[PDB]
Amino acid sequence: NYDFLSFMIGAAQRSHRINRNRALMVGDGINEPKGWLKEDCFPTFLTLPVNTGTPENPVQTPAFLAQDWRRFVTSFPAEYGDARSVMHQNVFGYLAAMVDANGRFLFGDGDLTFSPDLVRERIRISNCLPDPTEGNTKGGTGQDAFAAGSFIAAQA
Amino acid sequence: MNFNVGVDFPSFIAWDGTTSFPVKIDGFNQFGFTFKVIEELTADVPFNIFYHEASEADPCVPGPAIRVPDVPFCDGVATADGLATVVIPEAVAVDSFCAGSVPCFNGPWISIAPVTVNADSAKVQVTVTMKGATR
Amino acid sequence: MNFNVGVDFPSFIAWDGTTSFPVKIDGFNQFGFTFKVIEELTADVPFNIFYHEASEADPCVPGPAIRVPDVPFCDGVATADGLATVVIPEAVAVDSFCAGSVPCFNGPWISIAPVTVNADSAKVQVTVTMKGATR
Amino acid sequence: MVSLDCRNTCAPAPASRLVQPPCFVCR
Amino acid sequence: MVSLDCRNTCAPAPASRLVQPPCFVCR
């Protein structure tokens, strides 16, 4: 009493879309379309480290800070049309929960409903991209630091 | 009148007679092989076709050699061991050339070498021709 | 898919770094060179373009080398001595290639050799690619 | 005379030239 | 050969896996 043939057609189409989306982003060119993040042709920036220890002992551990994001976003040329950024939801959550010395936020300072819906027109969030935090297990207070060379976000 | 064919169809040495050179086929979407003789042969010389993955330590250096697998066509038998091979017969004269190719790409680098190194093997030359680019 | 490009656009070696090989172009109506550097250079290496013609003893063997003349273009000036030459610049990286071709045919054979055979000349490879078959 | 056409590299950047972003401005 | 079908559990989570939230970002 159910249309199993139509269900299978829909399932096959859904699988095709899901695989195509992973391709064009990470696929290699041997049997799948080559993705931009795998080709790695876009110029890259490298976040500055931090000496978390003492001046007498330079530790130079990796770190990520809000003004690094600000510099990255403001460094894009204005000639190249209208830019849009792509990133991961965990990264957005990490970015939106930073606080200054007085304990108040510094992104969406006075908003009680800050959410990706507000900035949807400049920032695109998809969970298929690499996640530097690895399920909120790195970068926080008391946790192991980030891993050098990790992907954070791309703009183009 | 004349054209700069080297801009659209670059070619690279693959086997100069004493050494094998990896060739990067990643930047081009099609390729082929060209075999030529420089002196009369005495025994059939079989060649092995390989492909290399990217090296672990440096992405711009090829890794270890891996041997290409076979792909049967519509109707036909697969190789005895399932791998690809090429054989240059005796009848080939010094004034002619032979061409071949592989149906599938696999790794980004490609290579070729004789099964054995001897007097007969050193008399052959191999070159790889690329088609239009994609970058 | 990928094709048997060697059937239509064959390539032959011309300078493997130690020896030059005359290449017959009579059967094809276009051609062009292709330079590749296998290791970093130390100084500019200039190349000379020669051409041969059928020998008297055997109509299928090239004769002595003759230096190709120059044909000025409408927006340039002739060379100092009026003969063609090729210069590979110092800035060429190990991971790049160059391509250039002569404007005229002259004889049915051709070859390319360096001005001086030294340690820098061994760092280059030259290949010739045909295009179009008249037979 | 011959004019040589050459392409940047076989790879877009065999070793990608990543660069540190411009340093901090001031206090 | 038989293919078994099994529900995740009679209750959605008899002991609900209430979990701590991700730790707050550094200062």
mmCIF file with all atom_site columns, all heavy atoms in Angstrom, chain B residues 30 60 65 81 87 90-91 129:
data_model
loop_
_atom_site.group_PDB
_atom_site.id
_atom_site.type_symbol
_atom_site.label_atom_id
_atom_site.label_alt_id
_atom_site.label_comp_id
_atom_site.label_asym_id
_atom_site.label_entity_id
_atom_site.label_seq_id
_atom_site.pdbx_PDB_ins_code
_atom_site.Cartn_x
_atom_site.Cartn_y
_atom_site.Cartn_z
_atom_site.occupancy
_atom_site.B_iso_or_equiv
_atom_site.pdbx_formal_charge
_atom_site.auth_seq_id
_atom_site.auth_comp_id
_atom_site.auth_asym_id
_atom_site.auth_atom_id
_atom_site.pdbx_PDB_model_num
ATOM 1  N N   . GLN B 1 30  ? 43.832 14.541  -19.549 1.00 0.00 ? 30  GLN B N   1
ATOM 2  C CA  . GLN B 1 30  ? 44.024 13.359  -20.382 1.00 0.00 ? 30  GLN B CA  1
ATOM 3  C C   . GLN B 1 30  ? 45.496 13.249  -20.750 1.00 0.00 ? 30  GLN B C   1
ATOM 4  O O   . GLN B 1 30  ? 46.240 14.230  -20.699 1.00 0.00 ? 30  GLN B O   1
ATOM 5  C CB  . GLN B 1 30  ? 43.158 13.400  -21.649 1.00 0.00 ? 30  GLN B CB  1
ATOM 6  C CG  . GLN B 1 30  ? 41.679 13.621  -21.386 1.00 0.00 ? 30  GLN B CG  1
ATOM 7  C CD  . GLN B 1 30  ? 40.854 13.692  -22.644 1.00 0.00 ? 30  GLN B CD  1
ATOM 8  O OE1 . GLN B 1 30  ? 41.371 13.957  -23.725 1.00 0.00 ? 30  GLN B OE1 1
ATOM 9  N NE2 . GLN B 1 30  ? 39.553 13.470  -22.508 1.00 0.00 ? 30  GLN B NE2 1
ATOM 10 N N   . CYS B 1 60  ? 54.376 17.983  -2.318  1.00 0.00 ? 60  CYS B N   1
ATOM 11 C CA  . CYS B 1 60  ? 54.817 18.203  -3.690  1.00 0.00 ? 60  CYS B CA  1
ATOM 12 C C   . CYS B 1 60  ? 55.859 17.193  -4.151  1.00 0.00 ? 60  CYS B C   1
ATOM 13 O O   . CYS B 1 60  ? 56.522 17.433  -5.165  1.00 0.00 ? 60  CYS B O   1
ATOM 14 C CB  . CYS B 1 60  ? 55.378 19.620  -3.849  1.00 0.00 ? 60  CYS B CB  1
ATOM 15 S SG  . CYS B 1 60  ? 57.050 19.859  -3.205  1.00 0.00 ? 60  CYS B SG  1
ATOM 16 N N   . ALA B 1 65  ? 56.070 3.691   -5.356  1.00 0.00 ? 65  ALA B N   1
ATOM 17 C CA  . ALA B 1 65  ? 55.443 3.222   -6.583  1.00 0.00 ? 65  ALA B CA  1
ATOM 18 C C   . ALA B 1 65  ? 54.368 2.184   -6.285  1.00 0.00 ? 65  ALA B C   1
ATOM 19 O O   . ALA B 1 65  ? 54.542 1.310   -5.432  1.00 0.00 ? 65  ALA B O   1
ATOM 20 C CB  . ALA B 1 65  ? 56.493 2.629   -7.518  1.00 0.00 ? 65  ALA B CB  1
ATOM 21 N N   . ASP B 1 81  ? 47.229 -11.862 -13.960 1.00 0.00 ? 81  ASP B N   1
ATOM 22 C CA  . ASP B 1 81  ? 47.359 -11.430 -12.576 1.00 0.00 ? 81  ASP B CA  1
ATOM 23 C C   . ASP B 1 81  ? 46.524 -10.197 -12.257 1.00 0.00 ? 81  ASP B C   1
ATOM 24 O O   . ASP B 1 81  ? 46.539 -9.737  -11.111 1.00 0.00 ? 81  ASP B O   1
ATOM 25 C CB  . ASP B 1 81  ? 48.830 -11.157 -12.249 1.00 0.00 ? 81  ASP B CB  1
ATOM 26 C CG  . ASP B 1 81  ? 49.402 -10.005 -13.046 1.00 0.00 ? 81  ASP B CG  1
ATOM 27 O OD1 . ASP B 1 81  ? 48.736 -9.552  -14.000 1.00 0.00 ? 81  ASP B OD1 1
ATOM 28 O OD2 . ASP B 1 81  ? 50.520 -9.554  -12.720 1.00 0.00 ? 81  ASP B OD2 1
ATOM 29 N N   . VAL B 1 87  ? 53.736 -4.654  -24.041 1.00 0.00 ? 87  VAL B N   1
ATOM 30 C CA  . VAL B 1 87  ? 54.772 -5.461  -24.676 1.00 0.00 ? 87  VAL B CA  1
ATOM 31 C C   . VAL B 1 87  ? 55.095 -4.859  -26.036 1.00 0.00 ? 87  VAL B C   1
ATOM 32 O O   . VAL B 1 87  ? 54.187 -4.570  -26.822 1.00 0.00 ? 87  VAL B O   1
ATOM 33 C CB  . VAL B 1 87  ? 54.333 -6.930  -24.830 1.00 0.00 ? 87  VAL B CB  1
ATOM 34 C CG1 . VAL B 1 87  ? 55.422 -7.741  -25.513 1.00 0.00 ? 87  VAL B CG1 1
ATOM 35 C CG2 . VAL B 1 87  ? 53.987 -7.524  -23.474 1.00 0.00 ? 87  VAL B CG2 1
ATOM 36 N N   . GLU B 1 90  ? 58.798 -7.801  -31.704 1.00 0.00 ? 90  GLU B N   1
ATOM 37 C CA  . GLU B 1 90  ? 60.041 -7.809  -32.470 1.00 0.00 ? 90  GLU B CA  1
ATOM 38 C C   . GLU B 1 90  ? 59.909 -7.042  -33.776 1.00 0.00 ? 90  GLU B C   1
ATOM 39 O O   . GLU B 1 90  ? 60.862 -6.386  -34.212 1.00 0.00 ? 90  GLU B O   1
ATOM 40 C CB  . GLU B 1 90  ? 60.460 -9.251  -32.773 1.00 0.00 ? 90  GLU B CB  1
ATOM 41 C CG  . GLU B 1 90  ? 60.840 -10.106 -31.567 1.00 0.00 ? 90  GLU B CG  1
ATOM 42 C CD  . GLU B 1 90  ? 61.591 -9.351  -30.490 1.00 0.00 ? 90  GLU B CD  1
ATOM 43 O OE1 . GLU B 1 90  ? 62.362 -8.427  -30.820 1.00 0.00 ? 90  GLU B OE1 1
ATOM 44 O OE2 . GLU B 1 90  ? 61.402 -9.686  -29.306 1.00 0.00 ? 90  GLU B OE2 1
ATOM 45 N N   . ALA B 1 91  ? 58.743 -7.109  -34.416 1.00 0.00 ? 91  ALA B N   1
ATOM 46 C CA  . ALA B 1 91  ? 58.572 -6.589  -35.766 1.00 0.00 ? 91  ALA B CA  1
ATOM 47 C C   . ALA B 1 91  ? 58.734 -5.078  -35.859 1.00 0.00 ? 91  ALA B C   1
ATOM 48 O O   . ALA B 1 91  ? 58.864 -4.557  -36.972 1.00 0.00 ? 91  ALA B O   1
ATOM 49 C CB  . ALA B 1 91  ? 57.196 -6.981  -36.307 1.00 0.00 ? 91  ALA B CB  1
ATOM 50 N N   . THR B 1 129 ? 52.410 12.445  -23.341 1.00 0.00 ? 129 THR B N   1
ATOM 51 C CA  . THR B 1 129 ? 51.817 13.639  -23.931 1.00 0.00 ? 129 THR B CA  1
ATOM 52 C C   . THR B 1 129 ? 50.524 13.984  -23.207 1.00 0.00 ? 129 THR B C   1
ATOM 53 O O   . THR B 1 129 ? 49.643 13.132  -23.068 1.00 0.00 ? 129 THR B O   1
ATOM 54 C CB  . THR B 1 129 ? 51.538 13.431  -25.421 1.00 0.00 ? 129 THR B CB  1
ATOM 55 O OG1 . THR B 1 129 ? 52.765 13.155  -26.106 1.00 0.00 ? 129 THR B OG1 1
ATOM 56 C CG2 . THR B 1 129 ? 50.891 14.665  -26.022 1.00 0.00 ? 129 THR B CG2 1
#
